[PDB]
Design a protein around this ligand. Structure first.
Ligand SMILES: [Zn+2]
Length: 67
């Protein structure tokens, strides 16, 4: 499929480590499955992929808020 954001790159199946900063705290969200644009790096995650990703995101946010 063509990337729905940059309209030139192709979407490919992959696993990526995703940097994230929340309330000034920096982390890398490891091993996130999804489709990724080879050109602009836009991600497309289906329901199951989104659930896994957001579990990581929310665990990180919770830890930051409690610290
Ligand atoms: Zn793209």
């Amino acid at each position: 499929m063509k990337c729905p954001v940059c309209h030139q790159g192709e979407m490919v199946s992959g696993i990526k480590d995703i940097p994230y900063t929340f309330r000034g705290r920096k982390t890398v969200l490891k091993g996130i499955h999804g489709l990724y644009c080879v050109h602009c790096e836009e991600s497309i995650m289906n329901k199951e992929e989104s659930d896994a990703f957001m579990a990581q995101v929310k665990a990180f946010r919770a830890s930051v808020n409690a610290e």
